[PDB]
């Protein structure tokens, strides 16, 4: 029983398409699905095989009325990921999930019977944007309305752009902080701050952030894309990133961001520095899973970790087994790469929630004003009740209060 | 030593005039490499040691999880549902169907099972081992005491794998309580005493599971993969293998030097592998409530307000319904991992110090 | 001799700096694991890239204080040295006990001056006599630290070569080497039969010039007053003993350097003379 | 904790740029950033320790109204350095106001390179004292580093604007920027075009070029003096101990330099050592004395004349310390990089408080008195006139430098317990 990459909306599709290109090239497999003819890492968790041994990666789309995805739809990669997958303000997205609620489960249950069985899904997704919000939070809910014991996770960038989005994001927070198993996340403002470190332009052209996100999202499952001996099951590794499923946002980074000598002692001393986190009443670290890769020495990086435990450049919390945890995947031969050790990192962290509180401040500003809820007909049939928006405040505000309370040492109890 | 060691090459593989202090010491060159080619390739040990690190040692994890997940329906449901027309067949199929197909087909053949000696309670957990069985000369490497030792390595690593499966299936019910659970706000306020017990388990065992990775599995391998291509003599590879296997057994919680730990450790593991059914029994109520609220949501797209008051009255019990269980688990975890100072001075000190990475002991205590 | 007496300077400038805040402390209170990670980073950052000869370095600590040599940051640690047989003709107990626990009586100087200078950081009215003593007492450390090691350097190496490389025979080679070892040390007043003991008493106020005045670089607002009331004290605590103890060591007729090198100033050449 | 060797203004981006080129020569680096074949250095502090030996220097490249920056960026050393450090007045007030209204990105660049260390031990601004963007913007950043990072050593490396009879507001800008050095900066090293002139009429058949060729001299001197901070030895490896043994007061921080082998464009070290004491051999302007004499010899070595070196210059007594306490010559050996050439085989150099800087301070101050009294070169533009009320930025600066004069003159004499 194995798992599938359900990919959705705009951002989620774009990073989904980038990893299903990049990971195909990361194995001994050609971009058209033919095997590299010369053919240490694991395909069968996400790939499937044609009768004629062509690699079929599983671009099982579940999206709505796309602005930009048509260029992905009308490409030679349709043939690589062949199997019948391409079919179709916030409440329009959620209600256009409601009108198809049988088929967005049943066809995926057929695909799960196309394995021996499915254990669950790792969904790439848009937080806010337009139609990807509401819809993704519907379809991933439906899957689990029908599957009361499976996995349905939601990794999604957060569009921190200084900013109808102050409503779309708060409704996405109300849903995903009650609907997502685990959430990997990234911000455009600090990625711009990283882009100023590598290029002498303010990245006017966008849609490049995909190159950084797509390997991190799939690093979250790399203990099962590569030989992860322990914590390998999908919940088998994810649950262990988590003290309690309300502290579920997983911030991100790398040793080199300019990753186009890095030996075992310096890559981890570099990593904990404030330069290396791709995001900006007290704040702590809560976890740091770094999925170290390359020409690593696995009988000296544990010694390095022992020294980094005493280097204390990661405060963590005076409570809980909050820690930095190392996950080697040995470098497979199928392609070359540079900077022969790095720790690609996801760190569970408090300080992502400051940006949630800033858009809560924007939401509190807009709730007195009501200048744009977009006034659509489907929006006005599904979410005109004005109780559904007020219940967003308590659901997000408990995430703020729990992340701030976890910085205190008396979090042993609820509060 | 020259005579003892060189004769297997002919048998099975198929001073005096002041002239001493010379070639007599140096004749062991003929043992030093010629034997290790036939006893690694013709009689397989390069194949078999590759199969130990990839499969028997759990030391690739891929094939292991793939078999267990082809058989999730029929190992939790007792393993008596799988017999000679199942077990040996679906093992060899699993090696073809997962990425373990990147290995030589003739070698996969010797990967089979070795059930527990007298154990009628045959669920896929108490009683299981994906053994790798050896006939011919190399049985001197993998003798009867050595296959008892690999059975114990397999048992500790499979029981740690059963802690992964249980503690993360446990959090998969908790994640249902964060995935289906988008109607009631206050269910963190009920389930927190179990969510943080799960923190004293899955989050605690993240550094334990990768401790087992880096210490018990990876650091063992560097002693021997540098050595099987080189080390003079199969009897001396066997000596190195005995020191290597005793190193694994003393990195593990299994050695005769560290038998004292096991009673405390079993008391930790018991409240792990027994808990799944109990904390799922709790979700029976919450799922019932979720499925009730979901059928109310299906009916909506006004009578549901009394159930929130009823849960507001009930929630204080079901939260406190774990306080006693949490600390009966945690007390013996804390005493064990400090009692762990009475054993392996590098390898198990690492277990103690990696697990309490920062201010869990010395601060939560 | 590269690792003793801080001569791998590009390591040691990094060493007593990155982890300084948990090395410097007045009474025990070091955290050795931090400097063990800096022992790797700061060596790779230094010149160990010229030749990877690190593995002989191991940390050692005091069984019985001074006399084995033949507070922390002050005298924090010293380094063990053992080798296999042909080098062990040269490195052996009577010699390696001048290894293991030496250069500690040199390490405190660099600590005490750099800690005094950390006070100078906290202020980059203001009676300049206090500022001038901060300069002046520091020069008493800095120029004797120059004398202690930045004196005879090349010759001892030039001697060691033409001694050992020509002889070839252990019956003389060990004599040449053991002679060379003491010859390098004879700069360092770490080696002195009188222990120059007034300097050890002076050290007790020298450390106060760091810690008590660091404390004052908060309590001055939390130097015209609470510095000043000790400037007169530090001044003629140091200048009395300083300008007698060189005269106490007036033994010699590359040598006579400790005396000649703080005679050199001309004012305060001495105050209580040998003759 | 490290030295973030900054460099500001367009002349600053000549002279600092030339310094980093000379430093990459002195360590041993080819123009791509490929290191020389032996690797001998505390490298990371000064050139950044990359993966594939991309040794990029720890220097910024800021300006205002660019007019030579694009020519500097087309030079072959454009991969020896090109981080994100290059970013955008004639009279001082314009650079202050333009930097204040532009500071959101340039100070971000400064903060990013400041965060590219463990901590700062010093911010060394390579700085034109009187030029149109060194004044204003350079001095404004030099204040802002003291506003944001006040206790760590804000530093400068500089040329004193002491050419007789280039910039049209020379003394007015000079004592404006000397407020930022005396008050807001914590240690500074400086060179004089008149001392370099009389040295030029010894070393060279040279003339007109002067300033742009003094780029070479400033850079080679700065490199050869900072040797102790960047090469190993038994002692003196660190800034914090060493520079404090030169600098007592919050004012007396203007170190100056002296060099022996002016015949450069085996030589007995006795004559090399006596030469450093001569009136011929200091690069800044009575027979002034040395508060200290650093001389870690960086050239060829003799295994017994290095023994004789200090013992012999004690006797020649061409210039005494005239001290207050233990001050004596800090001679040593130093390491030097292999593989580099040299036609002339020996060198020795001091950076120290030699007291001649007192006469050079009285030179800028008599020049500013000559401005305060004549009215004819007040340079009273509209861009400078309502920017500040009473020129507290300079008439106080004359008093702050007079305090420094009263201390340097006192340091010259044995009566240093007070001023005078």
Swiss-Prot record, chain B:
Where does tissue-level expression of this protein occur? Ubiquitously expressed.
Q: Which domain of life is it from?
A: Eukaryota
Q: Where, subcellularly, is it found? A: Cytoplasm, Cytoskeleton, Microtubule organizing center, Centrosome
**What does this gene product do?**
Component of the gamma-tubulin ring complex (gTuRC) which mediates microtubule nucleation. The gTuRC regulates the minus-end nucleation of alpha-beta tubulin heterodimers that grow into microtubule protafilaments, a critical step in centrosome duplication and spindle formation.
**Subunit record text:** Component of the gamma-tubulin ring complex (gTuRC) consisting of TUBGCP2, TUBGCP3, TUBGCP4, TUBGCP5 and TUBGCP6 and gamma-tubulin TUBG1 or TUBG2. TUBGCP2, TUBGCP3, TUBGCP4, TUBGCP5 and TUBGCP6 assemble in a 5:5:2:1:1 stoichiometry; each is associated with a gamma-tubulin, thereby arranging 14 gamma-tubulins in a helical manner. Gamma-tubulin at the first position is blocked by TUBGCP3 at the last position, allowing 13 protafilaments to grow into a microtubule.
**Family that this chain belongs to:** Belongs to the TUBGCP family.
Name of the featured protein: Gamma-tubulin complex component 3
Which gene underlies this protein?
TUBGCP3
Swiss-Prot record, chain C:
Q: Where in the cell is it found?
A: Cytoplasm, Cytoskeleton, Microtubule organizing center, Centrosome
What tissue specificity is annotated for this entry? Ubiquitously expressed.
Top-level taxon of origin: Eukaryota
User: Which residues belong to the signal peptide in this entry?
Assistant: none
Q: List the disulfide bonds.
A: none
What is this protein for, i.e. what is its function? Component of the gamma-tubulin ring complex (gTuRC) which mediates microtubule nucleation. The gTuRC regulates the minus-end nucleation of alpha-beta tubulin heterodimers that grow into microtubule protafilaments, a critical step in centrosome duplication and spindle formation. Plays a role in neuronal migration.
Subunit-level organization: Component of the gamma-tubulin ring complex (gTuRC) consisting of TUBGCP2, TUBGCP3, TUBGCP4, TUBGCP5 and TUBGCP6 and gamma-tubulin TUBG1 or TUBG2. TUBGCP2, TUBGCP3, TUBGCP4, TUBGCP5 and TUBGCP6 assemble in a 5:5:2:1:1 stoichiometry; each is associated with a gamma-tubulin, thereby arranging 14 gamma-tubulins in a helical manner. Gamma-tubulin at the first position is blocked by TUBGCP3 at the last position, allowing 13 protafilaments to grow into a microtubule.
The UniProt entry's sequence similarity note says: Belongs to the TUBGCP family.
Q: Which disease is it linked to?
A: Cortical dysplasia, complex, with other brain malformations 15: An autosomal recessive disorder characterized by global developmental delay, variably impaired intellectual development, speech delay, facial dysmorphism, microcephaly, and varying degrees of cortical malformations including pachygyria, thin corpus callosum and subcortical band heterotopia. Most patients have generalized seizures.
Tell me what this protein is called: Gamma-tubulin complex component 2
Which gene holds the coding sequence for this protein? TUBGCP2
Span within the full-length protein is 517 to 872 of 902
Curated annotation (Swiss-Prot), chain D:
Q: Which GO terms describe its cellular component?
A: apical part of cell; cell leading edge; centriole; centrosome; ciliary basal body; condensed nuclear chromosome; cytoplasm; cytoplasmic microtubule
One GO biological process term is:
cytoplasmic microtubule organization
Question: What's noted about post-translational modification?
Answer: Phosphorylation at Ser-119 by BRSK1 regulates centrosome duplication, possibly by mediating relocation of gamma-tubulin and its associated proteins from the cytoplasm to the centrosome.
- Binding-site residues, GTP: 130-136
Q: Where in the cell is it found?
A: Cytoplasm, Cytoskeleton, Microtubule organizing center, Centrosome; Cytoplasm, Cytoskeleton, Spindle
Task: Provide the GO MF annotations for this entry.
Answer: GTP binding; identical protein binding; microtubule nucleator activity; structural constituent of cytoskeleton
UniProt KW keywords:
Cytoplasm, Cytoskeleton, Disease variant, GTP-binding, Lissencephaly, Microtubule, Nucleotide-binding, Phosphoprotein
Q: Which InterPro entries match?
A: Gamma_tubulin, Tub_FtsZ_C, Tubulin, Tubulin/FtsZ-like_C, Tubulin/FtsZ_2-layer-sand-dom, Tubulin/FtsZ_GTPase_sf, Tubulin_C, Tubulin_CS
Positions bearing Phosphoserine = 119
Q: What domain of life does the native source organism fall in? A: Eukaryota
Residue ranges of the TM segments: none
Q: Which Pfam families match?
A: Tubulin, Tubulin_C
Q: Oligomeric state and partners?
A: Component of the gamma-tubulin ring complex (gTuRC) consisting of TUBGCP2, TUBGCP3, TUBGCP4, TUBGCP5 and TUBGCP6 and gamma-tubulin TUBG1 or TUBG2. TUBGCP2, TUBGCP3, TUBGCP4, TUBGCP5 and TUBGCP6 assemble in a 5:5:2:1:1 stoichiometry; each is associated with a gamma-tubulin, thereby arranging 14 gamma-tubulins in a helical manner. Gamma-tubulin at the first position is blocked by TUBGCP3 at the last position, allowing 13 protafilaments to grow into a microtubule.
Q: What family is reported?
A: Belongs to the tubulin family.
Official protein name in the record = Tubulin gamma-1 chain
């Amino acid at each position: 029983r194995e798992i599938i990459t359900l990919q959705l909306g705009q951002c989620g599709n774009q990073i989904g398409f980038e990893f299903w290109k990049q990971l195909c090239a990361e194995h001994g497999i050609s971009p058209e699905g033919i095997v590299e003819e010369f053919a240490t890492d694991r395909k069968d968790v996400f790939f499937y095989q044609a009768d004629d041994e062509h690699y079929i990666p599983r671009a099982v789309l579940l999206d709505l009325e796309p602005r930009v995805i048509h260029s992905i739809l009308n490409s030679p990669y349709a043939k690589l990921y062949n199997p019948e997958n391409i079919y179709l303000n916030w409440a329009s997205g959620f209600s256009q999930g409601e009108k198809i609620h049988e088929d967005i489960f049943d066809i995926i249950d057929r695909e799960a019977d196309g394995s021996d069985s499915l254990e669950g899904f790792v969904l790439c997704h848009s937080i806010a944007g337009g139609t990807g919000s509401g819809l993704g939070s519907y379809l991933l809910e439906r899957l689990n309305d029908r599957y009361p014991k499976k996995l349905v996770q939601t990794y999604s960038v957060f569009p921190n752009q200084d900013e109808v989005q102050p409503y779309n994001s708060l409704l996405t927070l109300k849903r995903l902080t009650q609907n997502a198993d685990c959430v990997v996340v990234l911000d455009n403002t600090a990625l711009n701050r990283i882009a100023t470190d590598r290029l002498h332009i303010q990245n006017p052209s966008f849609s490049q952030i995909n190159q950084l996100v797509s390997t991190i999202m799939s690093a979250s499952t790399t203990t099962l894309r590569y030989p992860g001996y322990m914590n390998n099951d999908l919940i088998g590794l994810i649950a262990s990133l988590i003290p309690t499923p309300r502290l579920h946002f997983l911030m991100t980074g790398y040793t080199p961001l300019t990753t186009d000598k890095t030996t075992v002692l310096d890559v981890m001393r570099r990593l904990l520095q404030p330069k290396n986190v791709m995001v900006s009443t007290n704040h702590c670290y809560i976890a740091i899973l770094n999925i170290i890769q390359g020409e690593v020495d696995p009988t000296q990086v544990h010694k390095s970790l022992q020294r980094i435990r005493e280097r204390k450049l990661a405060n963590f919390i005076p409570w809980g087994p909050a820690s930095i945890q190392v996950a080697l995947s040995r470098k497979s031969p199928y392609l070359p790469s540079a900077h022969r050790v790095s720790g690609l990192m996801m760190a569970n962290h408090t300080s992502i929630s400051s940006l949630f509180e800033r858009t809560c401040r924007q939401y509190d500003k807009l709730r007195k004003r009501e200048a744009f809820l977009e006034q659509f007909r489907k929006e006005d049939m599904f979410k005109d009740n004005f109780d559904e928006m007020d219940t967003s405040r308590e659901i997000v505000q408990q995430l703020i209060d729990e992340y701030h309370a976890a910085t205190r040492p008396d979090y042993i109890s609820w509060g | 030593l020259i005579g003892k060691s060189i004769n297997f090459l002919h048998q099975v593989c198929h001073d005096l005039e002041n002239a001493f202090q010379g070639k007599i010491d140096a004749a062991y060159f003929e043992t030093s490499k010629y034997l290790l080619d036939v006893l690694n390739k013709k009689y397989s040990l390069l194949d078999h040691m590759q199969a130990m690190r990839r499969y028997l040692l759990l030391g690739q994890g891929d094939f292991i999880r793939h078999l267990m997940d082809l058989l999730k329906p029929e190992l939790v449901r007792p393993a008596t549902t799988l017999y000679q027309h199942n077990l040996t067949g679906i093992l060899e199929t699993a090696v073809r169907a997962t990425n373990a197909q990147f290995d030589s087909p003739e070698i996969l053949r010797r990967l089979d099972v070795r059930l527990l000696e007298v154990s009628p309670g045959d669920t896929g957990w108490d009683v299981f081992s994906l053994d790798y069985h050896v006939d011919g000369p190399i049985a001197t490497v993998f003798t009867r005491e050595c296959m008892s030792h690999y059975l114990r390595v397999f048992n500790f690593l499979w029981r740690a794998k059963r802690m992964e499966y249980i503690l993360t299936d446990i959090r998969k019910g908790h994640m249902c309580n964060a995935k289906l659970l988008r109607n009631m706000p206050e269910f963190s306020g009920v389930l927190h005493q179990c969510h943080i017990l799960a923190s004293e388990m899955v989050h605690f065992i993240h550094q334990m599971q990768y401790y087992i990775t880096f210490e018990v599995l990876e650091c063992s391998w560097d002693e021997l993969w540098n050595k099987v291509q080189q080390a003079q003599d199969l009897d001396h590879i066997i000596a190195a293998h005995e020191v290597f296997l005793d190193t694994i057994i003393s990195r593990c919680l299994l050695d005769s030097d560290s038998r004292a730990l096991l009673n405390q450790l079993r008391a930790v593991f018991d409240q792990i592998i027994e808990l799944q059914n109990a904390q799922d029994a709790i979700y029976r109520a919450a799922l019932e409530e979720l499925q009730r609220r979901l059928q109310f949501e299906e009916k909506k797209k006004e009578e549901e307000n009394k159930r929130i008051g009823e849960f507001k009255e009930s929630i204080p019990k079901m939260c406190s319904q774990l306080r006693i269980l949490t600390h009966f688990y945690q007390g013996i975890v804390q005493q064990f991992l400090v009692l762990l100072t009475t054993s392996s001075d590098e390898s198990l000190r690492f277990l103690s110090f990696r697990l309490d990475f920062n201010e869990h002991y010395k601060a939560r205590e | 001799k590269r690792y003793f007496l801080m001569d791998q300077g590009d390591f040691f400038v990094h060493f007593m700096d990155l982890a300084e805040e948990e090395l410097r402390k007045p009474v025990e209170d070091i955290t050795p694991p931090r400097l063990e990670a800096l022992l790797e980073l700061a060596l790779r950052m230094s010149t160990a890239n010229t030749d990877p000869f690190k593995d002989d370095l191991k940390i050692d600590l005091m069984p019985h204080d001074l006399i084995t040599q033949l507070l922390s940051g002050l005298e924090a640690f010293s380094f063990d040295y053992i080798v296999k047989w042909p080098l062990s003709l040269i490195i052996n107990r009577k010699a390696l006990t001048r290894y293991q626990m030496l250069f500690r009586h040199m390490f405190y100087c660099k600590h005490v001056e750099r800690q005094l200078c950390s006070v100078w950081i906290s202020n980059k009215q203001w009676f300049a006599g206090a500022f001038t003593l901060r300069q002046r007492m520091l020069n008493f450390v800095q120029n004797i630290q120059y004398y202690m090691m930045f004196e005879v350097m090349e010759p001892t190496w030039h001697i060691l070569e033409k001694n050992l490389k020509s002889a070839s025979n252990i019956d003389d080679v060990l004599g040449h080497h053991t002679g060379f070892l003491d010859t390098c040390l004879k700069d360092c007043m770490l080696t002195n039969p009188e222990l120059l003991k007034v300097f050890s008493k002076l050290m007790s106020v020298c450390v106060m010039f760091t810690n008590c005045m660091q404390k004052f670089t908060q309590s001055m607002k939390l130097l015209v007053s609470g510095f000043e009331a000790t400037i007169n004290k530090f001044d003629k605590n140091f200048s009395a003993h300083l300008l007698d103890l060189l005269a106490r060591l007036s033994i010699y007729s590359g040598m006579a350097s400790v005396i000649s090198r703080l005679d050199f100033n001309g004012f305060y050449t001495e105050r209580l003379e040998r003759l």
